């Protein structure tokens, strides 16, 4: 719908941003549409990833990051707050020592930070959903 | 680009078709873009799946059957014909007894026929991949 998807922004993190997404999966969940959220070093593509957060809606969260070319630890999880036809709302926090996920107001993933946030100059939002809002805070000295 | 994705047509098939799709992934292959082709049994999305055809650009590919709702045997491949960064020709024929996918003129993929072509009703085309050209071919009696 309203945003290009693949959707890219450069941007900047701290402790106490947020980036807060609302879109909806292109399919139903019995044909496991993906959404992927990538926070880059780099505006090129290409470039390492310091939170990789992917969903394969109705089935299972896989996050990792990339170091360097190379993939590391993935960790997986099965819970699944997004609701099969519906619009969601996601909000990714920064914390001290880790990101937070909130799915429609419910924390539902956290990932330890690997690499400062700091280190991120761009978020990429892509797979098989429309995006009507991105927003990244700017609010924090 | 040019068309619609998620790509979706009413289509017939028998011994003699021929589905051909020319496209371009949305990422490079480092990021992992997928492609989707999925034979459908009605127009409905949720629909059975006679031939579900799906690339990992640069791991792997999974085909498989969706049969009253259930995914059946997967059958997986490492061969990888697409290249890096190009656009792409995909045919996929339909045999007496298989179908048979080629990549840029190249054999890479069949799937032997599970249920009866002529069950199928729909195409469709998805995830992360830009389209140019769809065609089924009707020539056959």
Same mark, same amino acid.
């Given at each position: 719908?309203?945003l290009?998807?693949?959707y890219?922004?450069?941007?900047? *993190?701290?402790?106490?941003?947020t980036?807060?997404?609302?879109?909806?999966?292109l399919?139903?969940?019995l044909?496991e549409?993906?959404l992927?959220?990538?926070?880059?070093?780099?505006?090129?593509?290409?470039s390492?990833?310091?939170?990789?957060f992917?969903?394969?809606?109705?089935?299972r969260?896989?996050?990792?990051?990339?170091?360097?070319?190379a993939?590391?630890?993935?960790?997986?999880?099965?819970?699944?707050?997004?609701?099969?036809?519906?619009?969601?709302? *996601?909000?990714?926090?920064?914390?001290?020592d880790?990101?937070q996920?909130?799915?429609?107001?419910?924390?539902?993933?956290?990932?330890?930070?690997?690499?400062?946030?700091?280190?991120?100059?761009?978020?990429?939002?892509?797979?098989?959903?429309?995006?009507?809002?991105?927003?990244?805070?700017? *609010?924090?000295?």
């Amino acid at each position: 719908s309203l945003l290009p998807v693949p959707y890219t922004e450069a941007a900047s *993190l701290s402790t106490g941003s947020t980036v807060t997404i609302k879109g909806r999966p292109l399919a139903c969940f019995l044909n496991e549409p993906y959404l992927q959220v990538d926070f880059h070093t780099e505006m090129k593509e290409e470039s390492d990833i310091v939170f990789h957060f992917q969903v394969c809606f109705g089935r299972r969260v896989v996050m990792n990051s990339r170091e360097y070319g190379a993939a590391k630890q993935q960790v997986e999880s099965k819970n699944m707050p997004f609701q099969d036809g519906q619009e969601f709302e *996601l909000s990714i926090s920064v914390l001290p020592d880790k990101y937070q996920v909130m799915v429609n107001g419910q924390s539902s993933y956290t990932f330890d930070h690997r690499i400062k946030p700091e280190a991120v100059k761009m978020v990429q939002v892509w797979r098989d959903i429309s995006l009507t809002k991105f927003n990244v805070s700017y *609010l924090k000295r």
